[PDB]
């Protein structure tokens, strides 16, 4: 209902949109629900308007997103580089969805940077770069999928958002707010959800497809990791870990530890959570916080990593007990910050 996106930006893109024959949509490395949801949401709309549209991402997306209509036609850059490169170089318009810095598309950077096609960014992350000619940057909005819905609506094409398109948009809104459990207080979110439901989507089924679709081994693994968790009561923090012996034992598949780092936050007075995993070769670190404790600051100092305020990661080249000791240093240094 409220006009968040600048009308001038909407006017400009509409010009590009009407002139364009060939359009490419790009999103970030290791794309997730909102990367794929926003991209596929835009794809379905654009494809309904007699346009050649291809979605290209650097990297495979999780299997729990395969159900999404159009997902099979998403082009993986690390498997069809030459083909993708041609599409990118020849695109009249390149839509950059759910990232704001060329490093977020890891190896696609150069071809995207070089292409003479007209670039527009549609994103909700903080601190955007100026590689796009049109920049729609709204970090106050909780997902890129919502911005895509908003853009299409403001252009006057709400009626051309299909059931399939709506499914993809809802999926991204859902995943980026943890099923509307964080950063979701805004009223207009729920009007948008209602609008998407009017397109025939089944939001409950979509929840199940994304979150209630994984192996017996994965869930037993989650339980084992939780059984062996370490809580530091004076530091409002929790630690969980997986070794190579533990991973191999439970038959670890890629993406099995996804979300594990969040579970310890469901303990009362635990606002900061760390997960340590040995790689296939040393210690991978995942950090999560609830509230305002800066995950990205600790990661940058103690694990040469980074990311966002509430979710970060990085590697530590050493051993488990050695990596655990480093984690215990950071807890000690930022102890006063945690107590606030
Ligand atoms: Na808007
Ligand atoms: Na941004
Ligand atoms: Na997401
Ligand atoms: Na909020």
From TrEMBL:
MF-aspect GO terms: metal ion binding; nucleic acid binding
Entry binding sites for GMP: 284, 286, 288, 313
Residues at which Mn(2+) 2 binds: 34, 98, 124, 176
Highest rank taxon of the organism: Bacteria
Residue span, DHHA1 domain: 249-332
InterPro entries from the UniProt entry: DDH_dom (IPR001667), DHH_sf (IPR038763), DHHA1_dom (IPR003156), Oligoribo/pAp-PDE_c-di-AMP_PDE (IPR051319)
Domain DDH: 22-173
UniProt protein name: Putative exopolyphosphatase-related protein
Natural source organism: Bacteroides fragilis (strain YCH46)
């Amino acid at each position: 209902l409220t006009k968040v996106i600048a009308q001038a930006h909407i006017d400009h893109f509409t010009k590009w949109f009407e002139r364009a024959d060939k359009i490419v949509i790009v999103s970030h490395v290791s794309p997730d629900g909102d990367a794929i949801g926003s991209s596929l949401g835009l794809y379905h709309f654009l494809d309904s308007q007699d346009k050649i549209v291809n979605v290209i991402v650097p990297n495979a997306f999780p299997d729990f997103l395969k159900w999404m209509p159009g997902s099979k036609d998403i082009l993986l850059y690390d498997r069809y580089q030459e083909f993708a490169d041609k599409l990118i170089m020849e695109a009249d318009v390149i839509c950059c969805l759910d990232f704001n810095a060329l490093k977020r598309i890891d190896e696609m950077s150069d071809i995207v940077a070089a292409s003479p096609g007209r670039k527009i960014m549609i994103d909700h992350h903080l601190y955007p770069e100026d590689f796009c000619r049109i920049t729609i940057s709204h970090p106050e909005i909780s997902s890129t999928s919502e911005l895509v819905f908003r853009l299409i609506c403001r252009m006057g094409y709400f009626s051309d958002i299909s059931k399939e398109g709506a499914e993809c948009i809802y999926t991204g809104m859902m995943t980026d707010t943890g099923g509307f459990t964080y950063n979701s207080n805004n009223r207009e979110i729920y009007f948008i959800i209602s609008e998407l439901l009017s397109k025939g989507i089944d939001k409950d089924d979509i929840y199940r497809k994304v979150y209630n679709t994984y192996s017996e081994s994965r869930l037993r693994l989650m339980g084992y990791v939780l059984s062996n968790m370490k809580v530091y009561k004076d530091y409002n923090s929790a630690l969980i870990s997986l070794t190579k012996e533990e991973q191999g034992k439970f038959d670890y598949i890629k993406g099995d530890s996804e979300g594990f780092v969040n579970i310890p936050l469901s303990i009362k007075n635990v606002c900061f959570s760390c997960f340590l995993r040995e790689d296939t070769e040393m210690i991978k670190i995942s950090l999560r916080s609830v509230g305002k404790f800066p995950c990205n600051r600790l990661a940058a100092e103690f694990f040469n990593g980074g990311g966002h305020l509430n979710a970060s990661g990085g590697e530590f080249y050493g051993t488990m007990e050695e990596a655990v000791k480093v984690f215990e240093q950071a807890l000690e240094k930022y102890k006063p910050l945690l107590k606030e």
